[PDB]
Design an enzyme around this catalytic site. Structure first.
Site, PDB file in Angstrom:
ATOM      1  N   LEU A   1     -17.676  -1.611   2.270  1.00  0.00           N
ATOM      2  CA  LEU A   1     -18.579  -0.533   1.862  1.00  0.00           C
ATOM      3  C   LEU A   1     -18.753  -0.494   0.345  1.00  0.00           C
ATOM      4  CD1 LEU A   1     -17.293   2.317   4.223  1.00  0.00           C
ATOM      5  CD2 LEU A   1     -19.337   0.899   4.485  1.00  0.00           C
TER       6      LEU A   1
ATOM      7  N   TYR B   1       0.863  -1.175   0.000  1.00  0.00           N
ATOM      8  CA  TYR B   1       0.000   0.000   0.000  1.00  0.00           C
ATOM      9  C   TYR B   1       0.897   1.221   0.000  1.00  0.00           C
ATOM     10  CZ  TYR B   1      -3.854  -3.124   1.305  1.00  0.00           C
ATOM     11  OH  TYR B   1      -4.755  -4.162   1.365  1.00  0.00           O
TER      12      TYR B   1
ATOM     13  N   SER C   1     -13.275  -4.265   1.567  1.00  0.00           N
ATOM     14  CA  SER C   1     -14.180  -3.500   0.715  1.00  0.00           C
ATOM     15  C   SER C   1     -15.602  -3.679   1.253  1.00  0.00           C
ATOM     16  CB  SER C   1     -14.105  -3.997  -0.732  1.00  0.00           C
ATOM     17  OG  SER C   1     -12.825  -3.764  -1.283  1.00  0.00           O
TER      18      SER C   1
ATOM     19  N   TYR D   1       4.428  -5.613  -9.692  1.00  0.00           N
ATOM     20  CA  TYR D   1       3.582  -5.954 -10.831  1.00  0.00           C
ATOM     21  C   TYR D   1       4.430  -6.347 -12.045  1.00  0.00           C
ATOM     22  CZ  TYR D   1       0.175  -3.562  -7.880  1.00  0.00           C
ATOM     23  OH  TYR D   1      -0.609  -3.195  -6.808  1.00  0.00           O
TER      24      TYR D   1
ATOM     25  N   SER E   1      -5.884 -14.559   2.294  1.00  0.00           N
ATOM     26  CA  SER E   1      -6.759 -13.559   1.682  1.00  0.00           C
ATOM     27  C   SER E   1      -7.003 -13.931   0.220  1.00  0.00           C
ATOM     28  CB  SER E   1      -6.124 -12.164   1.770  1.00  0.00           C
ATOM     29  OG  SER E   1      -6.984 -11.171   1.219  1.00  0.00           O
TER      30      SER E   1
HETATM   31  N1  LIG Z   1      -6.783  -8.324   0.816  1.00  0.00           N
HETATM   32  C1  LIG Z   1      -7.243  -7.873  -0.352  1.00  0.00           C
HETATM   33  O1  LIG Z   1      -7.230  -8.424  -1.442  1.00  0.00           O
HETATM   34  C2  LIG Z   1      -7.862  -6.474  -0.215  1.00  0.00           C
HETATM   35  C3  LIG Z   1      -8.441  -5.818  -1.379  1.00  0.00           C
HETATM   36  C4  LIG Z   1      -9.047  -4.491  -1.298  1.00  0.00           C
HETATM   37  C5  LIG Z   1      -9.037  -3.890  -0.034  1.00  0.00           C
HETATM   38  N2  LIG Z   1      -8.445  -4.533   1.183  1.00  0.00           N
HETATM   39  C6  LIG Z   1      -8.395  -3.875   2.557  1.00  0.00           C
HETATM   40  O2  LIG Z   1      -9.772  -3.570   2.838  1.00  0.00           O
HETATM   41  C7  LIG Z   1      -9.906  -2.145   3.174  1.00  0.00           C
HETATM   42  C8  LIG Z   1     -11.293  -1.741   2.790  1.00  0.00           C
HETATM   43  O3  LIG Z   1     -11.624  -1.723   1.405  1.00  0.00           O
HETATM   44  P1  LIG Z   1     -11.581  -0.765   0.306  1.00  0.00           P
HETATM   45  O4  LIG Z   1     -10.710   0.406   0.719  1.00  0.00           O
HETATM   46  O5  LIG Z   1     -11.411  -1.329  -0.964  1.00  0.00           O
HETATM   47  O6  LIG Z   1     -13.012  -0.288   0.466  1.00  0.00           O
HETATM   48  P2  LIG Z   1     -14.269   0.230   1.292  1.00  0.00           P
HETATM   49  O7  LIG Z   1     -13.714   0.251   2.678  1.00  0.00           O
HETATM   50  O8  LIG Z   1     -15.344  -0.600   0.955  1.00  0.00           O
HETATM   51  O9  LIG Z   1     -14.653   1.750   0.801  1.00  0.00           O
HETATM   52  C9  LIG Z   1     -13.891   2.743   0.826  1.00  0.00           C
HETATM   53  C10 LIG Z   1     -14.383   3.984   0.044  1.00  0.00           C
HETATM   54  O10 LIG Z   1     -15.508   4.410   0.769  1.00  0.00           O
HETATM   55  C11 LIG Z   1     -15.415   5.768   1.266  1.00  0.00           C
HETATM   56  N3  LIG Z   1     -16.098   5.769   2.568  1.00  0.00           N
HETATM   57  C12 LIG Z   1     -15.613   5.347   3.789  1.00  0.00           C
HETATM   58  N4  LIG Z   1     -16.560   5.498   4.792  1.00  0.00           N
HETATM   59  C13 LIG Z   1     -17.610   6.013   4.121  1.00  0.00           C
HETATM   60  C14 LIG Z   1     -18.832   6.363   4.648  1.00  0.00           C
HETATM   61  N5  LIG Z   1     -19.244   6.266   5.888  1.00  0.00           N
HETATM   62  N6  LIG Z   1     -19.798   6.905   3.705  1.00  0.00           N
HETATM   63  C15 LIG Z   1     -19.536   7.075   2.354  1.00  0.00           C
HETATM   64  N7  LIG Z   1     -18.322   6.723   1.864  1.00  0.00           N
HETATM   65  C16 LIG Z   1     -17.328   6.172   2.770  1.00  0.00           C
HETATM   66  C17 LIG Z   1     -13.921   6.050   1.259  1.00  0.00           C
HETATM   67  O11 LIG Z   1     -13.605   7.453   1.043  1.00  0.00           O
HETATM   68  P3  LIG Z   1     -12.902   8.328   2.208  1.00  0.00           P
HETATM   69  O12 LIG Z   1     -11.559   7.691   2.569  1.00  0.00           O
HETATM   70  O13 LIG Z   1     -12.757   9.724   1.592  1.00  0.00           O
HETATM   71  O14 LIG Z   1     -13.838   8.270   3.418  1.00  0.00           O
HETATM   72  C18 LIG Z   1     -13.411   5.188   0.082  1.00  0.00           C
HETATM   73  O15 LIG Z   1     -13.526   5.812  -1.192  1.00  0.00           O
HETATM   74  C19 LIG Z   1      -8.716  -1.561   2.313  1.00  0.00           C
HETATM   75  O16 LIG Z   1      -8.533  -0.115   2.474  1.00  0.00           O
HETATM   76  C20 LIG Z   1      -7.622  -2.549   2.723  1.00  0.00           C
HETATM   77  O17 LIG Z   1      -7.115  -2.220   4.062  1.00  0.00           O
HETATM   78  C21 LIG Z   1      -7.870  -5.825   1.069  1.00  0.00           C
HETATM   79  C1  LIG Z   2      -6.505  -5.735  -5.063  1.00  0.00           C
HETATM   80  C2  LIG Z   2      -5.144  -5.180  -4.604  1.00  0.00           C
HETATM   81  C3  LIG Z   2      -4.217  -6.368  -4.246  1.00  0.00           C
HETATM   82  C4  LIG Z   2      -4.203  -6.839  -2.728  1.00  0.00           C
HETATM   83  C5  LIG Z   2      -4.497  -5.799  -1.742  1.00  0.00           C
HETATM   84  O1  LIG Z   2      -4.243  -6.001  -0.534  1.00  0.00           O
HETATM   85  C6  LIG Z   2      -5.108  -4.515  -2.136  1.00  0.00           C
HETATM   86  C7  LIG Z   2      -5.408  -4.223  -3.405  1.00  0.00           C
HETATM   87  C8  LIG Z   2      -6.061  -2.882  -3.733  1.00  0.00           C
HETATM   88  C9  LIG Z   2      -5.321  -2.151  -5.060  1.00  0.00           C
HETATM   89  C10 LIG Z   2      -5.213  -3.057  -6.185  1.00  0.00           C
HETATM   90  C11 LIG Z   2      -4.400  -4.338  -5.759  1.00  0.00           C
HETATM   91  C12 LIG Z   2      -4.069  -5.115  -7.071  1.00  0.00           C
HETATM   92  O2  LIG Z   2      -4.347  -6.287  -7.266  1.00  0.00           O
HETATM   93  C13 LIG Z   2      -3.375  -4.351  -8.207  1.00  0.00           C
HETATM   94  C14 LIG Z   2      -4.204  -3.076  -8.596  1.00  0.00           C
HETATM   95  C15 LIG Z   2      -5.496  -3.591  -9.317  1.00  0.00           C
HETATM   96  C16 LIG Z   2      -4.471  -2.256  -7.295  1.00  0.00           C
HETATM   97  C17 LIG Z   2      -5.198  -0.982  -7.795  1.00  0.00           C
HETATM   98  C18 LIG Z   2      -4.533  -0.704  -9.220  1.00  0.00           C
HETATM   99  C19 LIG Z   2      -3.508  -1.880  -9.401  1.00  0.00           C
HETATM  100  O3  LIG Z   2      -2.243  -1.581  -8.799  1.00  0.00           O
HETATM  101  C20 LIG Z   2      -3.252  -2.228 -10.944  1.00  0.00           C
HETATM  102  O4  LIG Z   2      -4.071  -2.049 -11.780  1.00  0.00           O
HETATM  103  C21 LIG Z   2      -1.872  -2.796 -11.272  1.00  0.00           C
HETATM  104  O5  LIG Z   2      -2.021  -4.163 -11.733  1.00  0.00           O
END
Ligand SMILES: NC(=O)c1ccc[n+]([C@@H]2O[C@H](COP(=O)([O-])OP(=O)(O)OC[C@H]3O[C@@H](n4cnc5c(N)ncnc54)[C@H](OP(=O)(O)O)[C@@H]3O)[C@@H](O)[C@H]2O)c1
Ligand SMILES: C[C@]12C=CC(=O)C=C1CC[C@@H]1[C@@H]2C(=O)C[C@@]2(C)[C@H]1CC[C@]2(O)/C(O)=C/O
EC number: 1.3.1.3
Length: 325
Positions: free
Chosen positions: A221, A57, A219, A131, A168
């Site tokens: 939200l 990140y 994700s 990548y 994950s």
């Molecule tokens: N392990 C994996 O493969 C993987 C993949 C994706 C994500 N993750 C982890 O999961 C976390 C959560 O997911 P994500 O960031 O993709 O998504 P998310 O938490 O579902 O949504 C985040 C989005 O929602 C907004 N938001 C937050 N609270 C809100 C609220 N109360 N009302 C309206 N909008 C709101 C944020 O903007 P603002 O910041 O401006 O509030 C941001 O644009 C990541 O940040 C990361 O730590 C793991």
């Molecule tokens: C899902 C993922 C991978 C595991 C993780 O913990 C968090 C994320 C969020 C951002 C994703 C990332 C990827 O898998 C590669 C992506 C999809 C990136 C956003 C643009 C990106 O960097 C891209 O397009 C290069 O391939």
């Protein structure tokens, strides 16, 4: 039951995990420096005790900065904070696992992480590039060997570098691989996967519970909906009619409704927000509960459509989204 002051649920290895955590992924190029650090600090002050992050990140150093400052001032003790880090695809080679964890420990400047998980079941070509892609843009893959990688992860826990181990983006087959592994030492206690009203993970959740594996909903939200990588076929999760309707009933936002939904079913949520107001709003989910009928109606919103498909890697042998679950 669960309260702002006490919402940790048990893990199979004897540890526990705060049912709500702050996600820390944010588009590097569109994110001000220090935004993650400031957010983590506000989150801890608000009541969060779980922070989900990852070296890739590119802000893991901000996460550590914030955690250490809160410990230094006496806001919390190290044992009160739960941090989850992840092992990226380019670091799955057995010999690279520990050095990769150690790097994260040095970046955070902490002695250990509470949870370390294999970020994705797919292995990519090791290197300084997260990548890998040749001149033609063809993704440079690497032969995966989950079992071997896991043993390396088990060694890290044996060394005291991490309290709990997990995965994950792992499907049922990939989980079985580890669970049925000959001479298994540490079973995965968590599987972090996309999960929310539009993708409730009904079958994967039941499977994980059979093995006492806790599901962390990433994700939660519905994502930031960035077209660069998010499948926007589905409308804004937070704009859902039912979610907003139920919100008016409890005078809560759709976001709060969707977070309560998952935690009420024992699913950990790690909503990401770098906004002061929204960080606080997302934590206010302990002063109410959803009725069983509402819980069932929200679950009925499941569309079986992922916001995070990662289609660009659908050809990799370990792509986990081909199977039903
Ligand atoms: N392990 C994996 O493969 C993987 C993949 C994706 C994500 N993750 C982890 O999961 C976390 C959560 O997911 P994500 O960031 O993709 O998504 P998310 O938490 O579902 O949504 C985040 C989005 O929602 C907004 N938001 C937050 N609270 C809100 C609220 N109360 N009302 C309206 N909008 C709101 C944020 O903007 P603002 O910041 O401006 O509030 C941001 O644009 C990541 O940040 C990361 O730590 C793991
Ligand atoms: C899902 C993922 C991978 C595991 C993780 O913990 C968090 C994320 C969020 C951002 C994703 C990332 C990827 O898998 C590669 C992506 C999809 C990136 C956003 C643009 C990106 O960097 C891209 O397009 C290069 O391939």
């Amino acid at each position: 039951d669960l309260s702002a002051a006490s919402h940790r649920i048990p893990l199979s290895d004897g540890n526990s995990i705060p049912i709500i955590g702050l996600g820390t992924y944010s588009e590097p190029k569109s994110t001000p420096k220090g935004a993650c650090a400031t957010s983590v600090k506000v989150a801890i002050d608000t009541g969060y005790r779980h922070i989900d992050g990852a070296y890739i990140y590119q802000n893991e150093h901000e996460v550590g900065e914030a955690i250490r400052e809160k410990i230094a001032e006496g806001k919390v003790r190290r044992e009160d904070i739960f941090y989850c880090g992840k092992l990226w695809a380019t670091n799955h080679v057995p010999e690279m696992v520990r050095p990769t964890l150690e790097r994260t420990l040095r970046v955070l400047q902490l002695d250990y992480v509470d949870l370390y998980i294999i970020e994705v079941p797919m292995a990519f070509k090791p290197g300084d590039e997260i990548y890998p892609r040749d001149e033609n843009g063809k993704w440079l893959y690497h032969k995966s060997n989950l079992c071997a990688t896991w043993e390396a992860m088990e060694a890290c826990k044996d060394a005291g570098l991490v309290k709990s181990l997990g995965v994950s983006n792992f499907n049922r087959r990939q989980l079985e691989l580890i669970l049925n592994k000959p001479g298994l030492k540490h079973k995965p206690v968590s599987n972090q996967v996309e999960c929310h009203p539009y993708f409730t993970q009904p079958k994967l959740l039941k499977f994980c519970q059979q093995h006492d594996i806790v599901i962390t909903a990433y994700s939660p939200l519905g994502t930031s909906r960035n077209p660069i990588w998010v499948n926007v076929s589905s409308p804004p999760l937070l704009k859902d009619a039912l979610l907003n309707s139920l919100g008016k009933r409890y005078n809560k936002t759709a976001a709060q409704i969707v977070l309560r939904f998952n935690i009420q079913r024992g699913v950990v949520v790690i909503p990401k927000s770098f906004n002061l107001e929204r960080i606080k709003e997302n934590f206010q989910i302990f002063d109410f509960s959803l009725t069983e009928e509402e819980m069932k109606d929200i679950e009925a919103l499941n569309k079986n459509v992922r916001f995070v498909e990662l289609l660009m890697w659908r050809d990799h042998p370990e792509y986990p989204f081909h199977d039903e679950y």
